[PDB]
């Protein structure tokens, strides 16, 4: 956000996490890989927010996890963890949602 370059690097969803964990506590995020009959479960921890997601792929495993985290933020009116821009309600949701879709092109 500070620089246009950041917008470009925002190509991946993990960029939002790296910036969120950093701008909030200047600390890196925590990931965990589980092996269960269901497949693989990703555990994401962020200071006070912790989320988990089950998936059959590694790429989709983290993506789903990083999303659950962001959601908890909006609920606590703290979407500004890194500065998620949302002129309106749907803008905040829709904005993030696009960060996931833009994963490809």
TrEMBL record:
<protein>
    <submittedName>
        <fullName>DRBM domain-containing protein</fullName>
    </submittedName>
</protein>
<feature type="domain" description="DRBM">
    <location>
        <begin position="12"/>
        <end position="75"/>
    </location>
</feature>
